[PDB]
Amino acid sequence: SISTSAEVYYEEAEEFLSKGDLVQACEKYYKAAEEAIKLLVIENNLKEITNNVKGRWKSENLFKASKLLRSNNTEIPILWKSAWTLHVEGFHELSLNEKEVKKLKEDVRKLVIFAVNSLE
């Protein structure tokens, strides 16, 4: 009934995309992905990585988390890669076209909803 942090970042990424701000959108889509993973870690209750937690997490934790979550849903480790691509090549390298961003962001959407679902 109340939006998750994951859902909010996605909506904000969507806004930036609509206004042509690809750099900002990519970063928000990635943040949306990071939150989706945290939510999923919390729900599936993975003490392993949460203990490894010492604000935002270390990229390696997210990668670990995505791997570890392959048991719950085979696709998340690969949806996560797309998020990473958006992060590096998108926000940092500034080398992704609008068509490419849309393609990757779509994998984030699927990730976001998976999380939202693990709740209810």
Q: Domain holding 105: CATH number?
A: 1.20.120.330
Burial zone of 117 (CB within 10 Å; 0-12 exposed, 13-18 middle, 19+ buried): exposed
Task: Find the domain containing 47 and state its range.
Answer: 1-120
Alpha-carbon span 9 to 92, nearest angstrom: 18
Chain-centroid distance of CA 83 in Å reads 5
Alpha-carbon span 47 to 52, nearest angstrom: 8
Q: Which residue has the tokens 């928000």?
A: 28
Count of structural domains, the chain? 1
79: which residues sit within 8 A by CB, 6+ positions away?
33, 66, 107, 108, 110, 111, 114
CA atoms within 13 A on the CB side of 4: 24
Helix ranges (H only) for the chain are: 5-18, 22-44, 47-51, 59-68, 76-85, 98-119
- Resolution of the experimental structure, in angstroms: 2.4
CA atoms within 13 A on the CB side of 68: 18
Q: Which two tokens stand for residue 55?
A: 């604000």
